Amino acid sequence: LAGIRLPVFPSATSRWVFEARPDLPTTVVVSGGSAPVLEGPSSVRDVLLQA
Amino acid sequence: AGMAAAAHVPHTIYSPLFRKFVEWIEYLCLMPIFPLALWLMNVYAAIRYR
Amino acid sequence: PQAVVVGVMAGEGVQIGVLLDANAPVSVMTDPLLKVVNSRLRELGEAPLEATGRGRWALCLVDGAPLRATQSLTEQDVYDGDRLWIRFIADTERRSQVIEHISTAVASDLSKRFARIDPIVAVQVGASMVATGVVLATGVLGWWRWHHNTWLTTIYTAVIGVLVLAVAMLLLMRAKTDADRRVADIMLMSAIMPVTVAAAAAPPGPVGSPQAVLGFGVLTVAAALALRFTGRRLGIYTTIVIIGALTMLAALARMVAATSAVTLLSSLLLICVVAYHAAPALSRRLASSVRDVLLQAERARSFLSGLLTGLGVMVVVCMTSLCDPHTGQRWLPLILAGFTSGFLLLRGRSYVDRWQSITLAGTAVIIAAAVCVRYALELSSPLAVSIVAAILVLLPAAGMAAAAH
């Protein structure tokens, strides 16, 4: 019900790539704190809310 | 029901225990065909009352 | 005759009028020709044409096909006032690829030339199956009303109409792309059929003229309403409105008072005969500055195509009903059908559109075949069928032979 999902797959049918381009960090804003700031990868931000 | 399943399945993640179960439905569908067809053809009675 | 004037197209779109030597071979002119277009582009202040890697400069038709480098400009079918395009064509030379193991070889090759299934197409398949499913549902419910006067047909069909229309509304508002719109249109269009029979089935007693008035009426209204708020799929909705409208007129007259069906059929035939001449005018009135003209042109083109189809459907049903192998001067409607077909067969040449011209031409052919079939089923005897078979094969053979030979 909370939407936690557990990925299990055969590594996309390929070997690992340690040097892959990391995920782009997301920008956020606040009404009073109108100046935008970035907090981190979109994939990781969901976990803090799903829990 | 098929139109909904066709649009919904491609974007969801399913557990391996379920993906392993749908595979076995095909086999459970084949196993009864020959025994049922010969019954509809009335072969068993023709042999028993030889 | 020593020279010809033609418009030559160059990079990104400049057209230049030039007077070319009519008999020198084209390969002798492409180099100095390129210099001149560059000189004019340079003075105009635009970016000149330039080469990129390996390739060659070529002179082609506006269709892109290059002219034979050794032939004279007069030797080719290029006349004064025509236009050409100067172009750079890249080199295609590269190494060949080989795969030895037939298993891996077949997989790799076969995966390139053909398209595999994807989630986008998967939805259009399901959407089409549900549309087929409900048109079958209304068929069995309609067949029941033909033997029973109870409310079941309207009660059950009404809820289907509501359910199908409800789902279509969400898809229409959520849609984002042409693929998304296709699925929505197919679903909405599928709602017209159940709603239509749902209304016509409501009036009690045996089915006939009184029910006919409700059915073709709601049908015409629904098709028009969908066309008004959607503004897409013009041709198909237009066809439903026309056949629905004329059928409602016939239904109402027969329901109120009519001396004979022949009178109504004769009235409809005459209405359709005059409508063919009005169709282009109707189509024309039914329809950054560049956008408005192209939109107007394609919208107009669409309306005439649909409008012609609606008329074609009505005449064949009426015409085949008017002719008869036993009633009076059996030959009179046969020749009248012939004269009616002759107009359509000849007039098809007046329109530039391929599908419009093809539908007009086909409309005449089908009537002749349908009339002979009617006269073969009834008044059945070896002479009747023998004559009809010979006619039907000779009919188109002579037409194609006269055009191709």
Swiss-Prot record, chain C:
Record GO cellular component, one term: plasma membrane
Pfam families the record matches: EccD (PF19053), YukD (PF08817)
The organism's place on the tree of life at top rank: Bacteria
Key word Transport present: yes
Transmembrane regions listed in the UniProt entry: 120-140, 152-172, 183-203, 207-227, 233-253, 255-275, 303-323, 326-346, 357-377, 383-403
Keywords: Cell inner membrane, Cell membrane, Membrane, Transmembrane, Transmembrane helix, Transport
Keyword Calcium: no
Membrane topology category: Multi-pass membrane protein
Predominant place of localization: membrane
Locations listed in the record: Cell inner membrane
Phenotype on disruption: Mutants are defective in the secretion of EsxN, PPE41 and PE_PGRS proteins. Mutant is highly sensitive to detergents and hydrophilic antibiotics such as ampicillin, vancomycin and bacitracin. Virulence is attenuated both in macrophages and in the severe combined immune-deficient mouse infection model.
Additional free-text comment from the UniProt record: Was identified as a high-confidence drug target.
Function field: Part of the ESX-5 specialized secretion system, which is responsible for the secretion of EsxN and a number of PE_PGRS and PPE proteins, including PPE41.
Similarity annotation: Belongs to the EccD/Snm4 family.
Complex and partners: Part of the ESX-5 / type VII secretion system (T7SS), which is composed of cytosolic and membrane components. The ESX-5 membrane complex is composed of EccB5, EccC5, EccD5 and EccE5.
NCBIfam families given in the database record: T7SS_EccD (TIGR03920)
Protein name, entry field: ESX-5 secretion system protein EccD5
Organism: Mycobacterium tuberculosis (strain ATCC 25618 / H37Rv)
